[PDB]
Amino acid sequence: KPGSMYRNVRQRSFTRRKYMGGVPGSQVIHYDMGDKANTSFPVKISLIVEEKCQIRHTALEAARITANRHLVADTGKMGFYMKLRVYPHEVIRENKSGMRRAFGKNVGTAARVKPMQKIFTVAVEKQNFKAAKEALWHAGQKLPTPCRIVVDEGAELVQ
Amino acid sequence: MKIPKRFRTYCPFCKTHNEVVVERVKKGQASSMTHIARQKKRQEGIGNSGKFSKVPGGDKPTKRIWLRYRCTVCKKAHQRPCFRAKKFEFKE
Amino acid sequence: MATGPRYKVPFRRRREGRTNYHLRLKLLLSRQDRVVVRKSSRNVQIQLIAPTPDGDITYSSAVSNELAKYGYTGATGNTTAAYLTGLLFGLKSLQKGYEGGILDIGLQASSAGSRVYAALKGVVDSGFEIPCSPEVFPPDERIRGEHIAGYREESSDLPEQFEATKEKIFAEFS
Amino acid sequence: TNSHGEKRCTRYKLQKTVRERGISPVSRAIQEFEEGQMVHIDIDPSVQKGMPNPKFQGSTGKVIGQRGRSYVLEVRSGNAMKEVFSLPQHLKPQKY
Amino acid sequence: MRTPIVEKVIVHMGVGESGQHLVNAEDILRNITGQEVVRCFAKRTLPAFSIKKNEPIGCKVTLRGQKAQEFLETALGIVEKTLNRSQFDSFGNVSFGIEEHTDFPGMRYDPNIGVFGMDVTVVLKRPGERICKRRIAARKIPAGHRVTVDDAIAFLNESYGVEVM
RNA sequence: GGGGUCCCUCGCUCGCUUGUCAAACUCCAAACCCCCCGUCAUCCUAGAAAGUCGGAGUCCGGACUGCUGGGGUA
RNA sequence: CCUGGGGCGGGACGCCCUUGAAAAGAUAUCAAGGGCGCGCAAUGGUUGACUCAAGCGGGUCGGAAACUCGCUGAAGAGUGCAAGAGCAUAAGUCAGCCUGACGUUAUUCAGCAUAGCAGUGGAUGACGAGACGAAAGUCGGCUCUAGCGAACUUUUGAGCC
RNA sequence: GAGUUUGGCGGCCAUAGCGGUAGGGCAACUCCUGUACCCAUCCCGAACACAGCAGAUAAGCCUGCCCGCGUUCCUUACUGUACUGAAGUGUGCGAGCCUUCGGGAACUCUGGAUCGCUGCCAAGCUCA
Ligand SMILES: [Mg+2]
Ligand SMILES: [Zn+2]
């Protein structure tokens, strides 16, 4: 089931899980990566999406896996702090016959994100800025939206 | 449920509050000389009889508890729109 | 303890423990003046009140501090003083042009032979009209002040001065 | 299927705010109204007696008579004139 | 007007069931208290006691005035004027336990009744604490006007002579 | 409460600082909109609003622009 | 009969609540969450007296499970049962006295906005009787919104033609 | 004729609540004192009720203060942002989005205020 199916945002938010049945939970494991204690990272960059899209939990997990592996192989295991801001709260339901009784079963969750809303926030040192930026570039290739990187902290620290 | 055999209520004939004894209404036997029995005897012949060959319908899940409130002073009973209950008993 | 924005504080009189609003809604449905009898620990006070949306307004009133001018010397916070205050309130309200009103004891508990019901009997005996039941009225000897022989002999001045104040106030307002 | 009861779809029409929940002001319940006076129907959910429909919530009714405690209001519902009985607890005067 | 005077004395007998035993409990409590004694009702049914809801369990009595003073003097006599700081509440309202009603002189042990332990608690307040209990303009007492634990032990030492360590 | 002299491990639970949400959540809260009043505007004695009667057709509809309308992979 | 052809399945075929529904009203689908075809002489009425859930602290094998005292406590409880709304000197709990879970009758609402439409309810009243209460008031059942059915026929109640 | 204090009844129902400190009572209020009686306890005169000489402002109450928590209001920035009424031969492959005219937040932020306002009647005193 490709991500083009559950991508466009034309339906309201289906998140109240006490009035639905049996949501298969997200495959996304963690939401904080790297040094979860050092708040003294001067250069901080964030990956933002520039469309209104619904990111599946599997897409978020794949993007997090590629970004975290690239950052661990670039800046060491404790030379970065990467934050996946958005939780997949929407429940995605598929009509698994014909169109009679078409309200489908829940087949997974997803996160509805607005334009310019940050997905990943990465805090790195001065020298590891390029590796973090390039890993965030690899992260957005696994997402269903055009993504552009924006610098949070230390804009003067880079150029 | 339970309703008392005797309690003080309004007698519409004497126009006062008095003790009344509650009595369950007995469905009487159908008279054989009513106009519908004569019509049914008059409609029997060869073949179908119309409304008199109908088998009567079913019943509701709970029938109303049909009660009559006989006044203890003037003796004239009256009956009111009764509740619907499965199990009924009289408290004494 | 207004812990947050979803905290509903009571009304100000209810916060101060001074007014019941359910009883007030029950009483205000009469569209009649209330005989608001309030008793203090040293004397008693009675008012005639009619509500308007700007706030309650009081037409007539009478306290135990007025009983001195009619020739009363004893305690102003007993059953006899309550009866005399009620009689004075009834005569004064009759003179001003008020002859009706429902009783209003408010938060004070209801018990027969109290000071409030003594004031009620005083109001009723003055010609003022107020719906009441005679069971809650006090005995006539209690309004006279026949408690005196139990503890104190200086209380013996009470019944004669009560009768004197009664005749004086009746001559005063009539 | 959906129902057709009188309280249907009145989750917020007949709901009180957080800081007006509880007892209501008793002065609102003895507000005498004149003949022909324009009064606003703003239903008090706490007072469960003498209440009009939620469909008349927010309509201005012209007082035409009194039926005991409550008042007779000539209310407009779309294009028809309705007679809506409401106690003074649910009504509120119009000020100019 | 800051002396933490004895507001009331509370006695309770945790029988844990009803029948002949609870009647004997209330009778002996009335005998040793000199005042009519009420019972108590279980709030919920528990199979461990095998009790039922709305079923009598224990009995309690509230003692005030000179009766409260004399009963508290007797209780201090049975405890030999010994008490520790852990007995005291956060607001000085003490509560301790006794295990033998035959500690009280004047009552004879019966073989059927056995030995009963009743929990007694005496509440200490200040002269003016009626405001939170009355019916006309009741208001909460502040933190300053309340009774501290050290003031409670000082009052108990001065008036009852019970050393608390 | 879970684990290798209940010596100490320790997940829930409660606060300070972060990160996300709701169609059956709201301390908040619009723009449209609806009732009433006043004003202007238009209609109106060449007849306003209301009422009574005569005659029907009609209850297969469809499309464009919005409501992220609901459902649906579309 | 409805029906993303019909059939199988199901009843969205009667009634009630939340969303859908786009902040007046209305608004469909085999739209989503569901519930009801009952229970109760007290689980009802009224007056009085009190306040609940849950924590912290004290009390003896009465354990971290009972019962009891203090403090915090606008409600986090309870109100018979779906959902939503209401309620704290209470619409809750307990106790005293009671049977208004009364006979008869008129309007207007809302089922059925606008705008016709059945038996029914549900809010105001009226006549006659009461209950509780100092009185004001409250009571036309159980806080409000579901718990039910035409004509004909039979049976029954009071008095009449 | 006017004012202060006190009491009762209130209206608006937090700008009024929660919390902390400092002051006062001649009259008043309260605390406080007893239980002959009226009344009462699911036991207790604890409350209620009654009858009150004291003693105390230590609390209720009144006056002033503290921005601490909550609320309300203004204020600068976010910002004329979000959202939206009308029209559009404006634009995107598409989910959509843009320009014009007209409205216009919420959160947060800056600097501040809010620790009630007011109505009636009565008791007193101090009127010019
Ligand atoms: Mg077919
Ligand atoms: Zn009779």
Residue numbers in the entry:
A (entry chain BI): 4 to 99, 111 to 173
B (entry chain Bf): 1 to 92
C (entry chain BN): 1 to 174
D (entry chain BR): 2 to 97
E (entry chain BF): 1 to 165
Sentences from the paper on this structure:
Optimal yield of 70S ribosome particles from methanol-grown cells enabled cryo-EM density map reconstruction at a resolution of 2.92 Å, allowing detailed analysis of RNA posttranscription modifications, as well as the secondary and tertiary structures of ribosomal RNAs, the composition of r-proteins and their interactions. Although the ribosomes were isolated using a simple sucrose cushion method, we did not observe any cryo-EM density in the 70S ribosome corresponding to tRNA or mRNA in the intersubunit space between the 50S and 30S subunits. We identified 24 and 30 annotated r-proteins in the 30S and 50S subunits of the M. acetivorans ribosome, respectively, and a putative zinc finger domain-containing protein aS21. The 30S subunit showed modest resolution, ranging 3.0 Å to 6.5 Å, due to its inherent mobility relative to 50S subunit. To improve the quality of the 30S, we used particle subtraction to computationally remove the 50S subunit, followed by local 3D refinement of the 30S subunit. This approach improved the overall resolution of 30S subunit to 3.11 Å. M. acetivorans ribosome has a simplified r-protein composition. In contrast, the M. acetivorans ribosome contains only a single eL8, which binds to a conserved AUGUG motif in the 23S rRNA. The number of protein-RNA contacts for a given 50S protein ranged from as few as three to as many as 27. The three proteins with the most RNA contacts were L37AE (10 contacts), eL19 (12 contacts), and uL2 (27 contacts), which are highlighted on the 70S structure from methanol. Proteins L37AE, eL19, and uL2 coordinate the 30S, forming the intersubunit bridge.
pmcRibosomes are essential macromolecular machines responsible for protein synthesis. Here, we report the cryo-electron microscopy (cryo-EM) structure of the ribosome from Methanosarcina acetivorans, a previously unreported high-resolution structure from a model mesophilic methanogenic archaeon. Compared to ribosomes from extremophiles, the M. acetivorans ribosome has a simplified architecture, lacking paralogous duplications and containing a reduced complement of ribosomal proteins. Methanosarcina acetivorans is a methanogenic mesophilic (∼35 °C), nonhalotolerant (0.4 M NaCl), neutrophile (pH∼7) and strictly anaerobic archaeon that has emerged as a model organism for its methane production and scavenging.
